[PDB]
Amino acid sequence: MKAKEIIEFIETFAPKDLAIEGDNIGLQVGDNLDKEIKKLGIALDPSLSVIKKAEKEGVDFLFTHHPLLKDPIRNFTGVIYKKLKILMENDIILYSAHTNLDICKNGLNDALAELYNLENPKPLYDNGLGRVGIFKGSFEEFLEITKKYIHKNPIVVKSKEVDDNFKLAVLSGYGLSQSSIKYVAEKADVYLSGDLTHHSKILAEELGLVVVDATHYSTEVFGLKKFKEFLSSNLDLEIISLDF
Amino acid sequence: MKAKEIIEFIETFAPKDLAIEGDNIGLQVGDNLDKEIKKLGIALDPSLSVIKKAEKEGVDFLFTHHPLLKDPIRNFTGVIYKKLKILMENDIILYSAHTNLDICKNGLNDALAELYNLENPKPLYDNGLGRVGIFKGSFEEFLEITKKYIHKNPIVVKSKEVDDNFKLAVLSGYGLSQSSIKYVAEKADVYLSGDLTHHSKILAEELGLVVVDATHYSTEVFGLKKFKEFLSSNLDLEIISLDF
Amino acid sequence: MKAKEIIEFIETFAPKDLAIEGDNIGLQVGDNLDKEIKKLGIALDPSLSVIKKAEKEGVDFLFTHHPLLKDPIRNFTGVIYKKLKILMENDIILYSAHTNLDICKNGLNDALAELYNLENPKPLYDNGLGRVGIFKGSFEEFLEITKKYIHKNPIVVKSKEVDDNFKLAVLSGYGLSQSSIKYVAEKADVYLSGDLTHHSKILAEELGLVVVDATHYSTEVFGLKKFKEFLSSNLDLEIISLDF
């Protein structure tokens, strides 16, 4: 469809300047835009498996949530060498929307907000990430929606009894670090995100913040599935999932 | 009246230590604070026009909201040379109360909060700037007050619906940078401030924050007018505005 | 009971990672943690008086809220010499739980929250410190509770009329710096803490925050008494308070 034109469409949904400080968003690996494309792949992470499987299926435009490299390099060996080899031989464009996709209207965090039908939801953090608002319902109803739609067996740190109509906070991905938990404990009764260390569990219990670990995977793939749908039913392309 | 004493009065209303980190407040240019003062000028800005006009109208004490220099210098040429020449040649004192006037009780942000009759108003930012509270009324009633008392045709970024009794955030001056907007969006449904950039507009629509740009000038001058009157009523001394 | 066991108990109640960045918590002075402890002393502060008193009374394990040193040294003279000499000659162990005892469930801040029976209390600051919630009652009832259970004559900065069912912020210790006040003013109608500076007073008046200074001693010692009793109840040793 011309890569240039797909990218411009994605940057219309998720403007690049929504990305948090130092987020490596946009064109990752690629020369020759203007080239038309057939199979557009979509994955969470540009792991080698995902890059291999994209060549195997003749994907010529890989879209990932997570950037290829977080930190810059000037030597190319080991794993990064193979990933680039496959991508450069096969002329497969690799593009990324990371936090700009987590932050935009109807992005990964809005999707969680909508799922739980949060009342008057606002961004959680100063950088635009996450969403917080009232869950009009009970904690048990919150748990059912979560078990149904996000993750079947979520770790629940029930640090406090939860009244109906509590403030629910959600963060798609890794959101349960010690400092994240302290911050959100000021602003919410229940916090739904991924990756609960043992220390964070204890911290949550001490502060009285109820935490639900739905894993970083399930909370990201929920909104990513949605973005895939929005893509294929807006573009005449043919679009595959590579790690769902 | 005498210069020492006008300053003392101004600092009683707006104590210097209210000023945010790094703000150049207080005496800008002047050598003899015992100098009796016959005419006092007030301006938003110590512009060359304001300064020329001050000298031409025989102003011997010039008060400005904005300081002469944000960033220190060690060479004097061009515009700053011309400004200092006029102030020094005519022994016009130049004095500023900047953010301390924005932050103090009845100062520039209180003036806005009071206008909109905000319910249980509180400071917006960690540094004391801005006010946020509940506007007991409809979005419509709010716009009308804006158009009538602040600025006739404000650009409105109406990202989605605003219910009555919404959280209204106000900031006198330049309040619509990207980081400000991300921050206020956590705290308010509506944001009234000045100087909106195209990128900030997009950000507000993405985040769901309703923004009303009334210009930095209009939002500052409203409170400056109040500060002028308050000075008139308490001081026997001719007082003119040079800037508005 | 061995020293490492008492320490392990304390750290169960107040885990070390609860402490704010840079806080010097844990073993202050001591070498032999297998030491059988017969007499536990407890104090707000490892002052020279307290360390002398502890030796006079055969204390072999000294717990203090405040650390011995906040900033590191590499020279040993004056007061710090006299302190360490006593601790070392008598192999008295000195151990501290500082902000971790402030932040933990039923720690110093929670004790305040519980006393005023705050409605849905939450941590006040990003780092876990302080509690804030609704005081179900009048400003007057709130003062009677203060006067009776914390400090007899608290200084009150009545910056504003306070309605019933106000948002009350509590911070055990020194919470009344200018930056703390600007911040709490965003979040509360009334701030109960200790050690009010003159500039902080004016600042609170300007912003409309009602401040009650019950001193840093009285707000800390209240929770410390609870933790003493708790240490008595659980551990079997005799426990004397050297500071209160």
Residue numbers in the entry:
A (entry chain C), B (entry chain B), C (entry chain A): 6 to 249
Paper text:
MJ0927 is a member of the Nif3 family and is highly conserved among bacteria and humans. The crystal structure of MJ0927 determined at 2.47 Å revealed that MJ0927 folds into two interlinked α/β domains. Six protomers of MJ0927 are found to form a novel hollow cage-like hexamer, in contrast to the toroid-shaped hexamers formed by other members of the Nif3 family. Additionally, we found that MJ0927 is a DNA-binding protein exhibiting the ability to bind to both single-stranded DNA (ssDNA) and double-stranded DNA (dsDNA).
Two crystal forms of MJ0927 were obtained, one in the P21 and the other in the C2221 space groups. The refined structure was subsequently used as the template to solve the native C2221 structure by a molecular replacement approach. As seen in Figure 2(b), the intratrimer interfaces are tightly packed between the second domains of MJ0927 and the three subunits are arranged in a tail-to-tail manner. The surface area of each subunit buried in the intratrimer interface is 1110 Å2, representing ~9.1% of the surface area of each subunit. Therefore, the trimer organization of MJ0927 is a unique structural feature that likely contributes to its increased structural stability and which has never been observed in other Nif3 proteins.
